[PDB]
Design a binder for this molecule. Structure first.
Ligand SMILES: *[C@@H]1O[C@H](CO)[C@@H](O)[C@H](O)[C@H]1NC(C)=O
Ligand SMILES: *[C@@H]1O[C@H](CO)[C@@H](O)[C@H](O)[C@H]1NC(C)=O
Ligand SMILES: *[C@@H]1O[C@H](CO)[C@@H](O)[C@H](O)[C@H]1NC(C)=O
Ligand SMILES: *[C@@H]1O[C@H](CO)[C@@H](O)[C@H](O)[C@H]1NC(C)=O
Ligand SMILES: *[C@@H]1O[C@H](CO)[C@@H](O)[C@H](O)[C@H]1NC(C)=O
Ligand SMILES: [Cl-]
Ligand SMILES: [Cl-]
Ligand SMILES: [Cl-]
Lengths: 36, 405, 406, 410, 38, 37
């Protein structure tokens, strides 16, 4: 089920919970964060 | 019918009052050399967060995943890029069979395993006075354990310099200890592709944001940083946008943009993660390695790069900027290599990779001021406009007699 | 009858004020206003870069070699490989094969197409890109031809793409790219021409979108094997035209460039000059005219252009613009990679540890806390200020007259 | 008494004149200065002087037995025993050369002059300079004037002295500036067995860009250029003018610098340094001006080096340099690319008859030029002088006088 | 041979330039015949 | 006996003459120099 805030969305980019998008980071692995 | 003209010249005031109602500012410039000049604070970080030789089984157990030396299985990943000998050591270190975990504190970890100014600092001089590791105050940053020269805190007075050039500035020689660098098997906020140090030259009243605002210094070079101090003063409203320091920051004493940002970062991290990072101010549990990974790192990364809504920092009324000119020469020369190798008991090649010299000093003109001043204050307006102003009252009071005639 | 004698007075005093300050109007003084601040939001500049190598060795064909060989000093006038060749074994076996024209029939050749095809590819060079924590891609770079060949521009702000902005100071809110310069793809240097380089690395120019790059003249270097931090401050300069100042009165008389800039003025002149002398224009030049052939480059264009910039001070007169955007820069360096990260990078990009050390660089271009400075020429004395200043001494004598009228 | 509304019409109008003609004059005596700024591109711009030094003082191949005998201890190649110390870090190959060189058996010392030593054994611009261009004109070792510095024998481009005119540039960018290529000759570097003021851990050069009227202090004020790189230095010239008292602190001098024609802070410092060294040591160092015996190696070691080091770093009492009324500053932006590329290495190796590796260690290219806006002025001007204060007074009483005429009628 | 015209290589013969032309060495390349410079 | 001005105080830091202190130098060996307020 859906991935909550600040958690790794790695390998599933669509699985973020609502209001969240899966965001790739400069120095690290992608995570679910608030939409902007 | 100057009873027309006194109403006419009501325009002259009407304009030149309106200009004062604009509250004009002029910005004054001067560029000089100060008889004596207050040396700035110099903060630097090793680009490596944790000394390999200081990382224990307990450390590895708690912080291993964070540093990408372990997976969620508390195992050493096959992706490991390690050479034979370090892999040997790490597998041993990573063996948890019949191991019972002790308590773990992120701050203590940074403090113990962070690079030691006493090991790193080969030589130090300020103005020809020799200086020592006890001249450096420990400051925690995103980079881990960092050091600040001339921090001007704990009641130590700020250092000064009356002369331009290398000889009157700060010169340090460092060993960055690559051999002590943690192996990089993956990419986290706690890992680095780079060897060297980060440096920030700042006024003592301004805490460092060294990952954002710093500059680099590479090993295998002597780096000259020629500075000019520039002092900027702004007016508050009505004249300008600024905000005067005292009492304007939650966790800090004087107002600065960096101070405002660290405040926001801290609050945000506390709201989202319930903890604060090791380098943050305030009173709140320090994040655990897991909190770092599942909450704090993500929330902080997001806050600085992605989020433009949350932190609103007004411009300070007082800013101290340092102009910098960097240049480089090689170290060591073929001729000096063996001498250094012998002296520090290192291989000639080690010297070439790990050794740097840093010279921070001021040029002849060390001092520039850019200051907003009020262009029109309560003399100019009322002197001319307000002066002839009563003259129309003089005209009216008089011309009432043209009525009472 | 001294009531007229005092009328001579208010007439006398008036004009002997009225001349003076109304001479001072015609001195046309300017004051130059300064302010240095942080902008709530700041418009990120255009970032243009070039590989120091013009043509990828692997992309140079027999036909390419045939036409452009002499130019690159890989061939002599004989269409042969010179004995002066410094090449190692394997590259000559390749080049000698490539250079074998026996029963070879030359196809058509275009300098532009050559640059375009054989130039380094942003898609190969760009390992990572971020702007402000948004990830960015090769399609964020617009191709621009320069003297260096095929070059790329970030945030070019053209083709209707809006210009990027930044509200915050520091690395995290700026541009960070990682590049592989591909030395293994560098053309061998057997001699010295304008198309050859002793150096490995890239050239970069940070410029306002309204100003085209002259990156060989005005650019800066970034070396491989380092992370380079470039801390910027934007400085916006405004000048007055005559009578008050020197700046261009009629701006952008070219249809070549939407805006007037010194670089624009120079590229215009360079183009005209090359067209008059050589009958062709270089690949990176604007306008409508045949692109010079490799031979034209060598026998006409290169010489004429070199001469024009370095030797000739008569031909190009460029008036100063009324609007200039300058970027203050502070560069610093750390090493890449560390012994600890080397193997990880080697593995990741499928390259030898040493290759990484030679070919890999990281570039961070961002703004410091105070990103914004203005230096602006304003008119010190104008008419209206003049009206108000000389308004009083008339505002008497008119009414003094208005009593005495007969 | 609508007479009184005329009576207070003259009354407080006069008090206005007295009010302003007071305040303005008070201002005048405050001797206010305004500082005027302008930043532009000059149609033509005077190229600065470029001085550089090798970081190595003495070529190993040029050091003789007599040289070693006198200057050996100073360079830390010898002890007080005139012997080669066991601390020596030398390789076997240089060690033998040096032991031979260091053998004084039946050796009779000849005379020795520090200056001549620097001059002869110093690096030679003719060996170091592989290529030179200014603005596309090719330039030669004879375009460099020799200047002695703490670093030993150094060279200055466009020194603008000996009646040679100063070079100019009308255009921005690399092509219109100075580009030199150097071989720093590490193989010629003196071995470092110890630490003195005459020894260096670093390989490369030091450079100082300065107005021709200002002598170099290149150890204090210089910048670095590393071998194995092409270094671009983009410059902007900034010309600062100050007012003297009452308006400001500055000074102008001609000959009021005994050793120099124009006044500059560096000039003032070299004066002091020279005086101080003469008082303390009885000699002057090789790079100092004036008339006095050049210090011997021994004097360098037991007196001059210590006194000079002490004077610059420790002593803030002895030299007090007033600020000049005229200062020329150069804004600089440095950047770097690597030299050589793998592709160019063998070509350079072949061309200069050196190993590929040698090139990588010893070769650098330096480009010093101006950006498009090359010229900035920051100038203190007098804000209030007679013509303005008069024009205010005259235009002020010029009101009162007229506004009186009205009363002088009705 | 005869005189070398504008922009052409004067390499190895520095005097053979045509009139109004001098043989000029270039920073990055071989010398060429170019207009004389006051 | 006591070490006079500008002379090496190396290995004996207390042996400087009066008014002199033994001072370590950035690039070189320590020497006896005037005391500094
Ligand atoms: C700004 O800061 C400095 C140090 O805090 C202070 O001395 C100065 O008075 C301030 N500027 C002004 C003119 O308010
Ligand atoms: C010098 O380094 C070696 C490394 O093998 C070490 O054994 C020795 O203890 C070191 N000497 C010193 C000064 O401790
Ligand atoms: C200056 O030019 C910039 C673009 O180059 C433009 O956006 C701005 O409006 C101009 N300012 C003035 C005062 O002309
Ligand atoms: C300052 O000095 C330069 C020469 O050193 C001279 O050309 C210039 O006129 C002087 N500037 C002023 C305005 O004092
Ligand atoms: C090339 O260098 C070698 C060794 O340094 C030397 O023997 C030889 O004379 C040199 N060749 C030329 C052409 O000078
Ligand atoms: Cl922030
Ligand atoms: Cl041009
Ligand atoms: Cl001094």
């Amino acid at each position: 089920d859906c991935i909550p805030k600040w958690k790794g969305c790695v390998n599933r980019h669509g699985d973020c919970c609502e209001g969240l998008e899966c965001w790739k980071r400069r120095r690290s692995f992608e995570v679910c964060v608030p939409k902007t | 019918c100057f009873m027309g003209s006194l109403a006419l010249l009501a325009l002259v005031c009407t304009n030149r009052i309106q200009y004062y109602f604009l509250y004009p500012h002029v910005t004054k410039l001067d560029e000089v050399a100060a008889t004596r000049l207050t040396f700035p604070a110099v903060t630097f970080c090793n680009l490596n967060e944790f000394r390999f030789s200081r990382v224990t089984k307990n450390d590895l157990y708690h912080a291993g995943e964070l540093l990408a030396l372990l997976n969620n299985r508390y195992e050493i990943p096959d992706t490991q890029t390690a050479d034979e000998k370090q892999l040997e050591i790490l597998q041993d270190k990573a063996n948890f069979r019949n191991f019972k975990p002790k308590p773990f504190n992120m701050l203590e970890f940074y403090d113990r395993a962070g690079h030691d100014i006493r090991e790193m600092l080969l030589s130090c001089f300020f103005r020809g006075e020799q200086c020592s590791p006890e001249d450096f105050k420990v400051v925690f940053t995103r980079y881990g354990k960092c050091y600040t020269f001339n921090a001007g805190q704990d009641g130590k007075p700020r250092l000064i310099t009356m002369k331009g050039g290398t000889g009157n500035g700060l010169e340090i020689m460092l060993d960055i200890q690559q051999d002590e660098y943690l192996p990089v098997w993956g990419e986290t906020d706690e890992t680095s592709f780079e060897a060297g140090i980060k440096v920030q030259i700042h006024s003592q009243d301004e805490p460092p944001l060294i990952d954002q605002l710093g500059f680099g210094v590479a090993p295998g070079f002597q780096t000259f940083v020629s500075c000019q101090e520039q002092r900027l003063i702004y007016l508050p409203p009505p004249w300008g946008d600024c905000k005067a320091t005292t009492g304007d920051s939650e966790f800090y004493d004087t107002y600065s943009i960096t101070a405002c940002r660290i405040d926001c970062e801290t609050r945000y991290l506390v709201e989202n993660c319930n903890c604060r990072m090791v380098h943050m101010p305030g009173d709140a549990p320090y994040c655990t390695p897991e909190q770092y990974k599942e909450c704090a790192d993500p929330a902080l990364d997001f806050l600085v790069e992605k989020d433009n809504e949350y932190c609103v920092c007004e411009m300070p009324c007082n800013v101290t900027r340092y102009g910098k000119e960097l240049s480089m020469v090689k170290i060591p020369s073929k001729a000096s290599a063996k001498y250094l190798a012998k002296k520090y008991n290192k291989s000639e090649q080690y010297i070439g990779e790990n050794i740097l010299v840093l010279d921070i000093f001021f040029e002849a003109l060390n001092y520039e001021t850019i200051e907003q001043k009020k262009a029109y204050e309560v003399a100019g307006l009322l002197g001319d406009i307000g002066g002839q102003m009563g003259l129309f009252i003089g005209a009216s009071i008089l011309t009432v007699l043209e009525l009472f005639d």
